[PDB]
Design an enzyme around this catalytic site. Structure first.
Site, short mmCIF file in Angstrom:
data_model
loop_
_atom_site.label_atom_id
_atom_site.label_comp_id
_atom_site.label_asym_id
_atom_site.label_seq_id
_atom_site.Cartn_x
_atom_site.Cartn_y
_atom_site.Cartn_z
N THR C 29 42.27 36.07 38.89
CA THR C 29 43.56 35.60 39.38
C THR C 29 43.41 34.45 40.36
OG1 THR C 29 43.57 37.16 41.23
CG2 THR C 29 44.52 37.89 39.13
N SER C 30 44.33 33.49 40.25
CA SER C 30 44.45 32.44 41.25
C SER C 30 44.77 33.06 42.61
CB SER C 30 45.56 31.47 40.81
OG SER C 30 45.82 30.47 41.78
N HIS C 88 37.11 35.64 45.22
CA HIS C 88 37.00 37.00 44.73
C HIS C 88 35.59 37.52 44.99
CE1 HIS C 88 40.90 37.38 42.87
NE2 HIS C 88 40.74 36.22 42.27
N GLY C 89 35.42 38.83 44.87
CA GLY C 89 34.10 39.38 45.06
C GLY C 89 34.03 40.81 44.56
N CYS C 130 36.86 40.67 47.96
CA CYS C 130 36.76 42.10 47.67
C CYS C 130 35.30 42.54 47.61
CB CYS C 130 37.44 42.43 46.37
SG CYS C 130 39.20 42.28 46.56
#
Ligand SMILES: [Cl-]
Ligand code: NA
Ligand code: NA
Ligand code: NA
Ligand code: NA
Ligand code: NA
Lengths: 4, 92, 141
Positions: C29-30, C88-89, C130
């Protein structure tokens, strides 16, 4: 609110 | 004589191991919002670990998710300070 | 000697990696709102007298290359090093725009034996990402  | 090669790192994670981290599409992420606010208010007053501890409290207490999806709604977050520092850190 | 020496000529670098848009090939996701973060951090660390460098939408290859190059700079006149990762992660992992890279690979460049001009100096990694897919339901006080 959104998750990463 | 020697120092450990892993010494003098600090990892300021937005969230606890294993967890999602929350980001608001208008205000920015909970953690960076709070981090910048606490640095602005306390970088001339507080050691860095105590600044990050106030970030922990701010994220923990002032944020709660709001979602139309009940499975993502009313959730909380705690950031995670990981310190291999050997000294206190002041920005002034 | 209880406090790091922070009166070098320069406070140091603040590298901000701001990954908002990810390749379709990944689907991620953006990350709406991350530009607010990046600008907030830029201003915050500017006021702390850091030399801020903002970088947007980096592939995992570009992240590793940027960290390698920065680690090979001469930091002798710098008090500290800051790197901020917005992406993100997963646990132990941050995402380039085209896929995951181990945090350990990024931070290894700054190990005491690999970046000598940051020896004894604080190396700060600030990670908005994340670390898994668990949710904290909280408990009433
Ligand atoms: Cl944005
Ligand atoms: Na956050
Ligand atoms: Na914190
Ligand atoms: Na959390
Ligand atoms: Na990890
Ligand atoms: Na949560």
């Amino acid at each position: 609110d959104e998750v990463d | 004589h020697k120092i450990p090669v892993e010494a003098d790192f600090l990892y300021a994670y937005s969230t606890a191991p294993g967890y999602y981290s929350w980001r608001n599409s208008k205000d920015g992420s909970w953690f960076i919002q709070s981090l910048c606010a606490m640095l602005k208010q306390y970088a001339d007053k507080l050691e860095f670990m105590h600044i990050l501890t106030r970030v922990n409290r701010k994220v923990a207490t002032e944020f709660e998710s709001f979602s139309f999806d009940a499975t993502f709604h009313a959730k909380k977050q705690i950031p995670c300070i990981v310190s291999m520092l050997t000294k206190e850190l002041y920005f002034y | 000697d209880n406090s790091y020496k922070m009166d070098y000529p320069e406070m140091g670098l603040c590298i901000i990696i701001n990954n908002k848009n990810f390749h379709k090939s990944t689907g991620m996701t953006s990350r709406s709102g991350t530009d607010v973060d990046a600008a907030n951090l830029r201003e915050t660390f500017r006021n702390l007298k850091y030399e801020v460098r903002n970088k947007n939408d980096l592939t995992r290859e570009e992240i590793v290359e940027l960290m390698r190059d920065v680690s090979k700079e001469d930091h002798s006149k710098r008090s500290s090093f800051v790197c901020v990762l917005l992406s993100h992660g997963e646990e132990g992992i941050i995402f380039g725009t085209n896929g995951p890279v181990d945090l350990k690979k990024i931070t290894n460049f700054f190990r005491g034996d690999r970046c000598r001009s940051l020896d004894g100096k604080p190396k700060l990694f600030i990670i908005q990402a994340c670390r898994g897919t668990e949710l904290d339901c909280g408990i009433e006080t």
